[PDB]
Amino acid sequence: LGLLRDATACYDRAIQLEPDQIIHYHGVVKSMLGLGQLSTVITQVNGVHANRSEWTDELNTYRVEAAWKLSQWDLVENYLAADGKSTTWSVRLGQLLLSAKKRDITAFYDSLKLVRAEQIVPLSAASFERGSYQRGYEYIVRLHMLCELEHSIKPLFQHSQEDSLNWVARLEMTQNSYRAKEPILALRRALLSLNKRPDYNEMVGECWLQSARVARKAGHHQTAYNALLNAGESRLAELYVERAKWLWSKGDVHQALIVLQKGVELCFPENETPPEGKNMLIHGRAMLLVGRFMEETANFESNAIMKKYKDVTACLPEWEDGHFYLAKYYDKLMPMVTDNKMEKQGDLIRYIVLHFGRSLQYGNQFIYQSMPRMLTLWLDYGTKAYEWEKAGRSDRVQMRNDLGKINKVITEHTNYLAPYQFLTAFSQLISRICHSHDEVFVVLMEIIAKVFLAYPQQAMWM
Amino acid sequence: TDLQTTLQLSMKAIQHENVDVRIHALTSLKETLYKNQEKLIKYATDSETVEPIISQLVTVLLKGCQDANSQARLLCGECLGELGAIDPGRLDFSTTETQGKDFTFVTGVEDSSFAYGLLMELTRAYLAYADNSRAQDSAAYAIQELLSIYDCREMETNGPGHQLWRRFPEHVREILEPHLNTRYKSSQKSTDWSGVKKPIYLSKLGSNFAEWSASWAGYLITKVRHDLASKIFTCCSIMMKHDFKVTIYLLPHILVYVLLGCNQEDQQEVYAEIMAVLKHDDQHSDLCQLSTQTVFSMLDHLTQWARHKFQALKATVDYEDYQSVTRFLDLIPQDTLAVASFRSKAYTRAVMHFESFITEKKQNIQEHLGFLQKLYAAMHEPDGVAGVSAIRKAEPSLKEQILEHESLGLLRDATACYDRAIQLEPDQIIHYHGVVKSMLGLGQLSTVITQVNGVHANRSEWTDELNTYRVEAAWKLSQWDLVENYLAADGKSTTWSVRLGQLLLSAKKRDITAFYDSLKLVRAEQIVPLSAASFERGSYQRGYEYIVRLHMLCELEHSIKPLFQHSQEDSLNWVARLEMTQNSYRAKEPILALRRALLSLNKRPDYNEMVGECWLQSARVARKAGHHQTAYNALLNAGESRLAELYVERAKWLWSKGDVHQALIVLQKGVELCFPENETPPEGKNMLIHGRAMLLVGRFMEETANFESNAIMKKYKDVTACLPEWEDGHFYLAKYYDKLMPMVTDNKMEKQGDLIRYIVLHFGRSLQYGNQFIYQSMPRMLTLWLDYGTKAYEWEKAGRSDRVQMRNDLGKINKVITEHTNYLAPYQFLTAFSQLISRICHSHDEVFVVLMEIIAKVFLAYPQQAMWMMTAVSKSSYPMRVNRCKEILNKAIHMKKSLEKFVGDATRLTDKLLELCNKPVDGSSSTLSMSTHFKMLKKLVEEATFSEILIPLQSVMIPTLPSILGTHANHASHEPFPGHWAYIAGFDDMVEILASLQKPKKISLKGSDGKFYIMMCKPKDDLRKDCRLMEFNSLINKCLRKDAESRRRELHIRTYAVIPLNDECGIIEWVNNTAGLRPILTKLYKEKGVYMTGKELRQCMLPKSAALSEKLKVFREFLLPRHPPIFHEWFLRTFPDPTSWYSSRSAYCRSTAVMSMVGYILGLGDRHGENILFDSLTGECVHVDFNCLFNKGETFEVPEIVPFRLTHNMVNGMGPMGTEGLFRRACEVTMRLMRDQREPLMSVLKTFLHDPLVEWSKPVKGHSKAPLNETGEVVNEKAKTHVLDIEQRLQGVIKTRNRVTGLPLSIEGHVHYLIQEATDENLLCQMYLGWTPYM
């Protein structure tokens, strides 16, 4: 159970205690290897080799893993010729990458068959199906890796055919864990290095950023920081965004906001438009992250946060996250603004259900936060307007008109949105069936009926 | 001998003139320290501040380390090690030194002072060259020609020759008179000066420093147009050719003079020379460095003379002379001066020239941020590296990140960046240096050795510089054979670690000679940076690292000498020698490593265990410092003293990481594994540790929500029963009962009675065993007691049945407080005297009787301070306060009759002081005389019978508490207020009247020492609030002195005395050499010629009700432009010396930071320009007029929207980086301290917010202060609110009305918000023109 980066200290204490013990020297380079520190690894094992020329043979694998990650193909050659007894995965991957660099078609395909069989063997024993696929994901991500490899190398040999593997999608398809995504990404960097396309200096920064993302999402932040470093050489605004997200993870919301503001004014200066599609998308992600930081920080005024979210929506209207977080903030403010008085909440409710629905039109990532909250606000305001109309309160007619606006917004959603988007929360809609307000009931009827058509069998049961 | 008289004598001898006497005194003060180490450790450690003698000593020591002789320079450091590396916060350094400074830009050869300087130099050359006749005869000719150029002989006249002959010393005069009248002949080897290449520097004659300097001086003397200048230059021409020093001294004048009469071509020639000295670096000899210094000095004198000539200009031909000097000073490029100073390793002057280049010549800081960063790295000012990293928009390059981290000290990030750099450029030794250094500081020693051997395999040449780390690891591992092999490899490695390895090895092989020689060597190379640093102010803290290295060398020498043939056992108290040090990792860690290595050399039996205790101490240090990973690397290296000293430390480590539950878990595992429930530990050490652990378990429980309160109380009571003599346990139990009592009593005092009794009892029992919480325990104790007495009076007046039960409970509590009175020491009450002087008007009679016993005990112990603190309560208008104080004083008198004449005398003196104070001014008089108007006061004071009354300084009014380390029993005879006590011996003959509307009458109180102390008397005002505020500020200055970051920054809330002689008057102590911001900036603006008259200001004023945008438009269009930034000109004018300039600028940034945040916390307002004051000597700021406290300003008709004052002028002084840099990180540091010490601060403040005596409600309330039937207490209605707001501001919370729930801000983010808010033009504009937000 990896406590944290600092397992090396324990291995070194062990060494001080039993220096002849090798397992510890293995553990040290292995930790330095995981925490970037690639070039540091190569010196560690060479020092050991000097002290004890016998251990290097079993430590050669770590000197090879570092080399092909650094893309030092000449070094790979020496560290491989030194010892052929090692069959560690990293060593075989280095052998393949070298056979590709020094184009050796026969050797490449042969060693490929060989390693690919080596990795299947653990699956053969784990093939007995008791949650096997998850027990062997490590060996299945290795086959994924070998296939990415075969498809990136084949063109380097042919000259024609080229790689059709969608490297992006192939990654989200995987388990969102560093133990799985990173090996794919380091191999992808090495493959981008073997080939040399003009973008293949930039795409490497992209892969380093993805590695930082998976690490961050996976907790350990220092290797993420190393990846970020290795991403700088490529000019990107995503770098500032990810550095902020990384600080945010460490809890330093303020330093993150500061960095992100620096990156936005530098990468997206106010003068020139950001409308390069990709640049626009990044500018929107960044302004959103800014509005989200500002939400956490108490200093920032609510109006400025609302304005930032609105600018995000205007930069990316087809984007879900923008509308969603904007409406979330409207909802967080509305009780405080309105003094927890519904009749005053009408227009805010309109904006909130509106942006919630737009969010659902473009994506269903937050549907469990949005559709329920939207329907709840709407049905509740309907109950309240029926009450105040029933009580004869003064603001009731204004409440009636605002409820009309909101019923219209809900209708526009009913038309734009997909019935399955309503399907989740059908139990909620089947709940407010007895809503008192008639027009609200009509909107709810058109909503759940539009669902009944799409999915009657599953609806009639509910 | 008491060892204090011995130290006085010995120090006097240290600073003796004869070098041999100095040396023998130092040597005697190196056997003296060793033999009296126990006593010295009692001094430096018994109290939180090192006893005065120790401060006088280290100060006399360092200045000694500047001693020319190497043997005395060594004996100095040695005594600094035999003495210990005391924490610079313990050291006073009140007056560390007063360096002499030429108080002019000597006008020229006409000036009598420059005359005397030349004559001193010529006589010095005469005495020096008596060995070489030619040079001495040249000197005699020069000196007679000086006597001629200007008369040096009075001839019985009062002419210049008179005061000049009197100006020379007697030895110079006896040298002069013989040759004063005798003619001498000059060499007359005249030179055309054409053949020499005008850029003389780097020429053949140039390559010789004295030769270049002499040739340039000759060419200048030829260019000189002024006649007297030509004479003085010709007479010393030969001397300049003989002595480089006379030249250096006279060159700036040659420059000033030629520039005045030089034609454009001549100016260009001299400019070519000067710009060539600076543009040259090395080989494209000491010549470059020395000549760079010389030209820097010439230019500095030229600038001083330009400024003086401009003073005369505002005060013709002199206009043209000033124009010439300004022209030339402009001709030279500031950037070149900066790069030169840097190359010359004069980083401060380079910083000054760079700041000028940025401001004097409008430039964009971003292009030059990198150079500034290199400078701040070399200056080792990390706040500067950070301010640059922040001011920078662009993405930091790899190398820049490396620098930022090397300054930050983040080992992890530095390691990663260094490896990335190695990948980028593999052929860099510095990156591998950083990698191995990171692997070393993290504790990965063997990893270090292997990395080194590997890089040696790759690059052999690379190893000899990397060997240091291999050998450091080895001697840390105790692999002495590897140490030997590695040391045999490096023949020239001089680094500290290698020398320490050599010493340790020599000790391992028992090579006495080698050890002691390499010790005299490894000890001199450390005293060198100290001799270089001793010249500056705050040198101890600058050279602490090296002082700590000297402490380490002492510990070594004394742990090894028994290892040799061998009384010679090491008598050092390692634990105390460590506690005395600074509570930082950078200091205590190397000490501990060397301690464990010395042990590993001695291999005594216990030493296997002592190594574990040293590792645990290192872990605790890194934990208290935040280096958690190193704390873990240590918790591993330990295991021998595992009788819960490990489990305890591991639990604390986790707690610091925030994992409270895992901490409690592991700690319970320890308490079960060791100190098992089945067998009680009675062992003293085991018992102490078991108590520490039970208490940590109780604290964790309390932090955890799951645990029931009763279990927590049980655990704390178990602590008390196990370690009852312990302050903790008692204290924490009472603190819990205090948090628990409101809940258990539903906030009803009635049920609180018995809980209050227990709480008070345990708070006092804690105060009996230790004073670690004298500030958190005593105030709450007294508050609970006085308040329960108040509620009892209230309910006995109301007639409630519960009133009788309250009476019984109050009797119990009063008995408890009486037992405390008898047990506790007087000073423990003194630290809260102001609170007790406050309750002097308590409603309950019995409570007041007990309070009176307390106050009278304190008085009978420390009468002067008490009287000064309670003189007001006696003179107040309320009759109740007066009667209570008279009763207290009469009680004290009955206790001790001697405190009767002193009482009457102090009362008379105070009466006359407030008479002087409430004096009707004659009108237009800048001064009133003491002998004419205030004669009766001078009479009272001058009378011999008159008792001795202290000059009520802050250092004498604010106690010094003993240290928790001080055996916890010192507090029976402990002496607060240690040092020199100065009594009111006489009053000066002049009584200045200030220009304020209040017309405060400044006075000067003559101290018994004879020194003159200045004390202002404020006209009608409430100084009591200010008094208790100065108390809080002294507590803050304490908390800052102890904290390492703060003290490394030298943070300090400037503090002075605020003594109220009445409710209307007080007598504030005057901090000398202080001028306000508004007067300063107005003087500078006038000199600049741009100024805003009152009429313009009234026109610029908008109606109080106006568009914010309009106020801003006016404040940006007219006010700000008319008032540009000049403060930096003040810094440059008052601190001409570059080093002094940077020191004072940094201290301005770091002191206004402290007092800004201190103020925001205290809700400080009314920070107008005349209330902020800046010290002309140190640049620190000193606030005044603390009448508006706790956001009372926001109630002013013109609300205060600025939390503190950061105006564009105030920023321009901080530098080009502005807020970002030193000021911001100092704000962060002090806010962090305030937040960590939130509890003591809040506890003392709640005694300030609820103080009844202070006039919280300024209005009369229908002359309430007279019309109180039986009360002297004015309640603070906004008390709880102010307390809550302050607790928020400390927690990081800010109340936000923009419909937001809220969340605590990080210290960095809180500081950023504060700064933004205080420098935001939109807020400044709203401020009344009294704040002078434009200034």
Ligand SMILES: C[C@@H]1COCCN1c1cc([C@]2(O)C[C@H]3CC[C@@H](C2)O3)c2cnn(-c3cc[nH]n3)c2n1
């Ligand atoms: C450091 C200086 C000199 O040393 C003594 C302390 N002190 C001053 C100076 C001033 C002023 O100079 C400020 C402006 C300009 C002229 C006049 C007086 O109004 C005040 C005002 N209030 N207080 C108070 C009250 C409680 N503590 N301090 C002052 N204390």
